[PDB]
């Protein structure tokens, strides 16, 4: 059914993403989401493809939807954080990088980011 097709589309997205086919990835993930709109990982993955395209607003909206579906999605915070730091919104980035560390204390990406953001906040 569509539930099963959705995971197939996700997996095709992941292959596209791994080969740097960023638009193809976006398009697979869009279809994944159209078939199953209640999966935080599908949105979080699409954010990642958008980040690579410099589509930062779209990445943010997607990380923001991923958190609605699942508050504990670590990568949604890391990725929204990155898009914000890219859009020079350093206060908002730090909040997200801080929250990722609340969920995943050892997270190396959030700790590197906090240190870099310190000298802008």
């Amino acid at each position: 059914g569509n539930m099963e097709a959705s995971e197939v589309m996700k997996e095709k997205g992941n292959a596209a993403y791994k080969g740097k086919q960023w638009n193809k990835a976006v398009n697979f993930y869009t279809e994944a989401i159209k078939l199953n709109g209640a999966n935080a990982t599908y949105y979080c993955n699409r954010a990642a493809a958008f980040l690579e395209l410099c589509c930062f607003q779209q990445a943010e909206q997607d990380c923001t939807k991923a958190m609605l579906i699942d508050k504990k999605n670590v990568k949604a915070y890391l990725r929204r954080g990155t898009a914000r730091e890219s859009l020079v919104r350093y206060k908002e980035a730090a909040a997200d990088f801080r929250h990722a560390l609340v969920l995943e204390p050892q997270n190396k990406t959030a700790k590197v980011a906090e240190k870099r953001l310190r000298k802008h906040i």
Binding site: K18, A25, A48, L78
Partner: peptide, 8 residues
Amino acid sequence: GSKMEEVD
């Protein structure tokens, strides 16, 4: 560890 460069 969540590696932000990896999709899931």
